[PDB]
């Protein structure tokens, strides 16, 4: 969660309909768009994030939320328009006798601005004396594991969330929507609607 990736898919329309319906969803909410009519708008670029969170911290990644994950690992602004896409990963992110491969930042000086990724491995000071590169009383380590185990409750299930950030700026749009077709009725006076001409 402290080092979230970002992809930029563009230059063609959005056809998110072959995702095998994503049987485990558990979370489907759209803030500023309607799920029914969503492909009728042309967008420039679409961004998506990738991270893993616990079960008791799913409702923390939302505009207008405070805490330790929503302020020190990932924060979204108040002006956001998109949906929520996430699923459970309890059968994959768990091994025998505990799984320790995920880290998260807990201690920091101030909060993170929206769209800010920090991969600093520096020590944090909680007093008035320098750490001098050695752990002591007023110097702790701001990184720890998660202790993901399969034998747990519904508040430990890992949720891989993908955050769509549809963007339409001041340039040729590229992520539009898919189109259909009919057959070719010949020798009949009927209406025709091609790409540009009617």
């Amino acid at each position, epitope marked *: 969660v402290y080092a979230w990736n970002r992809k930029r898919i563009s230059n063609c329309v959005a056809d998110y309909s072959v995702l095998y319906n994503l049987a485990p969803f558990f979370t489907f909410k759209c803030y500023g768009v309607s799920p029914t009519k969503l492909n009728d708008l042309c967008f420039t670029n679409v961004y998506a994030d990738s991270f893993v969170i616990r079960g008791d911290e799913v409702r923390q990644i939302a505009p207008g939320q405070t805490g330790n994950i929503a302020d020190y690992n990932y924060k979204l602004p108040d002006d956001f328009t998109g949906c929520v896409i996430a699923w459970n990963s309890n059968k994959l992110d768990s091994k025998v006798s505990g799984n320790y491969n995920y880290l998260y930042r807990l201690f920091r000086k101030s909060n993170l601005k929206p769209f800010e990724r920090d991969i600093s491995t520096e020590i944090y*000071q909680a*007093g008035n004396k320098p750490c001098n590169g050695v752990a002591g009383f007023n110097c*702790y380590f701001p990184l720890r594991s998660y202790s993901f185990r399969p034998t747990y409750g519904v508040g430990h299930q890992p949720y891989r969330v993908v955050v769509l950030s549809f963007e339409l700026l001041h340039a040729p749009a590229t992520v539009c929507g898919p189109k259909k077709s009919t057959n070719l009725v010949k020798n009949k006076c009927v209406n025709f609607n091609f790409n540009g001409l009617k």
Partner: antibody
Amino acid sequence: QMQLVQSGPEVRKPGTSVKVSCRASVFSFDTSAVQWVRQARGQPLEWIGWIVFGSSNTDYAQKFRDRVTITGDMSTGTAYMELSSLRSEDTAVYYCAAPHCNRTNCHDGFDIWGQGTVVTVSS
Amino acid sequence: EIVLTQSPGTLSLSPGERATLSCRASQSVRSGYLGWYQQKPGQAPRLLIYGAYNRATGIPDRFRGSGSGTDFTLTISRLEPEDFVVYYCQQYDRSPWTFGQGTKVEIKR
């Protein structure tokens, strides 16, 4: 006044499990710490026995870390201490201490102390 | 682990004088994690001097700390008798935290 309440005396058998607590309100800032020091009648202090609530990193002495264990709890803000294999050498007074810490930074020394807990094992 | 060896065991003086107690160590410790404490027989200990340069709240303006590097000492401005108890020193710089034996002060008669 910021104070730390501690339990009272307790008598046990020669060898059992003892649990001494130290409840406070500063233990809900993810950065507070609390130590457990033992002092006998006339004898000076013995060890440190500290624990940091949050990122649990335990560190005991040489004689310790074999029959003692310290846990933490941030929900109620009460510390715990378990000491097994009680023999006829632990007759002393246990004290509690925790420095005043804020929500982002702590102090630079132990300010507030506890009351005391007398443990005696006899008939 | 670092140990503390307090040289002054018993030092009796008269009310209205100056007393000097010291608490040194074996090796060289950092002069940023030193703390002095005061404990009354039959009561709870309290903080007296933290950091060896700064004083605590409520402490009168008579406990002055000195020494750095390997030897530390505590000086008294005026011996007004209200704290004739045993003092202790703590070096909370390394991982093993140790203490001293004890410095008791009595009244001369």
